[PDB]
């Protein structure tokens, strides 16, 4: 009966690890199903999930719920209304976001895979080799596939703190990373963006047993990023090596501002960096995005008139839905997690 899918959320909305994110994801399903013209709302709230504006959208959702309380029920609005005021997020336990983002990257890749001319990356080489020649890349005359484009683009770690330092200093934000200097180690795991190794994955979303790092959040750095931006899934820092993409790119912007397609070609790169870095576990959308979105690093784009779409796809639906499903189950099986941690306590 359907009233077991409704109770299920009445019961999934009562877990002690529910946060701001999971609410938006479960509610929509709840609205999408309690109802069955309201197409825009699941896109308006969606756009906001990719931007981490869970704050306003929770409320708009709970404004639609009341306005359309007619086609919904007293119970859904009651419950939904009780849970919202009491909401916070923890990077460590914000894991639905992580699935979304892990799945989003693979989505931004086909896109880039559908973006044919990969010559854009090849030309970028001539700019790296002039930034750190001592560490010059000397590879395929042509980067033909994104896997080739990706590995090299991930090779900017060769550009040391030395050629990037002029840039890292002026940021006010970078001095505020909160990655502790305690080398906690490596832990083996089943999915990369969802670094949590004990996360309930779907067997479909399972990758090989790769060894992921454990990173700690130094809560005491005054101004920790995690403190200022808690929605961002796991962040102990801000993307340092992004400062390096910029060197290779500052030299490129100025050499190919002459070309008229640079607007496209710069987003092809920035988007790829954003995707591969989220898939491979190195960072989070926002860790990378907040750096390039800096007063000093945006000037370069302004001078040559480039408008960046920092990897923002407006068809993020499949990813949304897939996550709505995550929480659904995660929440039920972790609420009985204590039904049998209470029935058992009735044997002793």
């Amino acid at each position: 009966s359907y009233q077991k899918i409704e109770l299920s959320i009445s019961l999934s909305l009562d877990s002690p690890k529910l946060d701001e994110s999971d609410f938006i994801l479960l509610s929509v399903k709840y609205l999408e199903k309690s109802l069955g013209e309201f197409s825009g709302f699941f896109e308006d709230i969606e756009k906001l999930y990719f931007k981490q504006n869970y704050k306003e959208a929770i409320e708009k959702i709970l404004d639609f719920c009341k306005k359309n309380e007619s086609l919904l029920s007293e119970q859904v609005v009651q419950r939904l209304a009780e849970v919202a005021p009491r909401l916070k997020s923890n990077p460590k336990d914000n894991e639905s976001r992580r699935l979304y983002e892990t799945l989003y990257a693979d989505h931004l890749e086909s896109v880039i895979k559908q973006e044919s001319d990969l010559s854009v990356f090849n030309e970028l080489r001539d700019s790296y080799n002039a930034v750190k020649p001592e560490y010059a890349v000397t590879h395929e005359t042509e980067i033909k596939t994104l896997d080739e484009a990706k590995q090299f683009i991930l090779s900017f770690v060769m550009l040391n703190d030395n050629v990037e330092l002029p840039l890292k200093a002026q940021s006010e934000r970078y001095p505020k990373k909160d990655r502790s200097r305690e080398e906690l180690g490596n832990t083996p795991s089943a999915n990369p963006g969802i670094m949590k190794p004990n996360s309930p994955n779907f067997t479909d979303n399972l990758v090989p047993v790769r060894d992921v790092p454990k990173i700690a959040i130094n809560e005491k750095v005054a101004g920790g990023y995690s403190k200022t931006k808690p929605t961002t899934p796991f962040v102990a820092s801000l993307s340092g090596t992004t400062y390096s993409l910029m060197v290779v790119l500052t030299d490129y912007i100025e050499k190919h501002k002459t070309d008229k397609d640079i607007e496209k070609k710069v987003n092809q790169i920035i988007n790829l960096w954003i995707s591969s870095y989220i898939k491979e576990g190195y960072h989070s959308y926002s860790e990378v995005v907040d750096v390039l979105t800096e007063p000093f690093l945006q000037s370069i784009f302004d001078k040559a008139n480039i408008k960046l779409n920092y990897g923002v796809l407006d068809d993020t639906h499949a990813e949304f839905r897939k996550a709505q499903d995550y929480v659904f189950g995660l929440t039920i099986q972790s609420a009985m997690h204590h039904e049998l941690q209470e029935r058992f306590k009735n044997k002793e």
Partner: protein, 183 residues
């Protein structure tokens, strides 16, 4: 009001980015919400100044805020409003004393300084009431501080000098002299 203006477009995110001034300088209670909702005219719009000089405009919201009182489903509630609560009570009382209670419904509180809260309830209690009834909803103009005014009066009375719980009395019985002297 803050919700309904943010929705209009004017936002008040912070402790006070002023809506109380709007609540008591602009808002009013209708006799009929529907008539006033239909009134195309932009004539029921009053505008005001933010601190810096940014003037914003409120209309429609002028008469919905005071109505939450008569139709609290707006705010998500199921208690029925001021109009009928007054009757529900006048009807859990004796048939014999209700002639008096109906002709003496006196509004008090700063939440009744809304212009129009007298006649709406006149309409709404004259309808529900029996038809042979005589009614007079009384809204004294000094209602904002009436509870206090009613106290000066009592204390200005030569006869209210016997009704005071003295300490002498308190030390003996305790705090339960109040149930015996103050009813």
């Amino acid at each position: 009001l803050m919700k309904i203006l943010t929705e209009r477009g004017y936002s008040f995110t912070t402790t006070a980015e002023i809506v109380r001034d709007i609540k008591e300088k602009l808002c009013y209670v209708a006799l009929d919400f529907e008539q006033e909702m239909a009134t195309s005219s932009s004539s029921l719009e009053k505008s005001y100044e933010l601190p810096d000089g940014q003037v914003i405009t409120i209309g429609n919201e002028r008469f919905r805020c005071p109505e939450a009182l008569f139709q609290p489903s707006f705010l998500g509630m199921e208690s029925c409003g001021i109009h009928e609560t007054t009757f529900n009570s006048i009807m859990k009382c004796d048939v014999d004393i209700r002639k008096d209670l109906y002709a003496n419904t006196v509004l008090s509180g700063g939440t009744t300084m809304y212009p129009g809260i007298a006649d709406r309830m006149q309409k709404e209690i004259t309808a529900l009431a029996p038809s042979t009834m005589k009614i007079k909803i009384i809204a004294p103009p000094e209602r904002k501080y009436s509870v206090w005014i009613g106290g000066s009066i009592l204390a200005s009375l030569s006869t209210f000098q016997q009704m005071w719980i003295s300490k002498q009395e308190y030390d003996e019985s305790g705090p339960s002299i109040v149930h015996r002297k103050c009813f």
